[PDB]
Specification:
It is classed as hydrolase. This is part of a larger assembly, with chains A (110 residues) and B (51 residues). Chain A has 110 residues and is α+β, with helices and mostly antiparallel strands. Chain A is built from two helices and two strands; from the N terminus they run ββαα. Chain A is 21% helix and 8% strand. The relative contact order of chain A is 0.11. Chain B is built from one helix and three strands. In chain B, β2 and β3 form a beta hairpin. Chain B is elongated, with a radius of gyration of 18 Å. Classes of the chains: A alpha+beta (110), B alpha+beta (51).
């Protein structure tokens, strides 16, 4: 792991190996894809950067499912109609219409 | 009878060796590399064999 990014062509690295060697980076991988605290590949005796590691873990945050386009629609409930227009105007409507937000100059509610 | 004797003299020669680490493969990657976590040790990317 890259500890921290020292911009004057340096960086802090913690090695669990032993040796470290200050090298010039390859041209496939850049420092713009290096972030502080990132995992990177080092050799075991010339300790140089082949590439950054591309294997990242599970979002560890509190219970979440992400879903693109769920099955259900709002045509099944009925007689509730007014409430349904309220969310409509706020959320759905700016996506549908750029320029209606431009005329007014404001955002629909967050 | 002769074949078996030849098997024995061979065996003495080979035995001076150096072993292999046990690991567990976390996941395979298409660089034809594997990421492995070795048990008292660290994790490495290693290049698959021929077979």
């Amino acid at each position: 792991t890259l500890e921290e990014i020292i911009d004057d062509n340096h960086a802090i690295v913690s090695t669990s190996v032993g040796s470290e060697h200050y090298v010039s980076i390859l041209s496939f991988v850049d420092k713009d894809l290096l972030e502080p605290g990132c995992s990177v590949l080092l050799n075991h005796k010339v300790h140089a950067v082949i590439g950054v590691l591309m294997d990242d873990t599970d979002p560890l945050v509190t219970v979440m499912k992400v879903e693109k386009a769920p099955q259900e629609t709002y045509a099944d409930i009925g007689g509730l109609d007014n409430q349904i227009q309220e969310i409509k105007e706020s959320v759905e409507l700016p996506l549908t219409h750029p320029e209606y937000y431009e005329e007014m100059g404001i955002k629909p509610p967050k | 009878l002769n074949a078996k004797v030849r098997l024995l003299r061979e065996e003495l020669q080979l035995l001076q060796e150096q072993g292999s680490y046990v690991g567990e493969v976390v996941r395979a990657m298409d660089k034809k590399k594997v990421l492995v976590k070795v048990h008292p040790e660290g994790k490495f990317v290693v290049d698959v064999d021929k077979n």
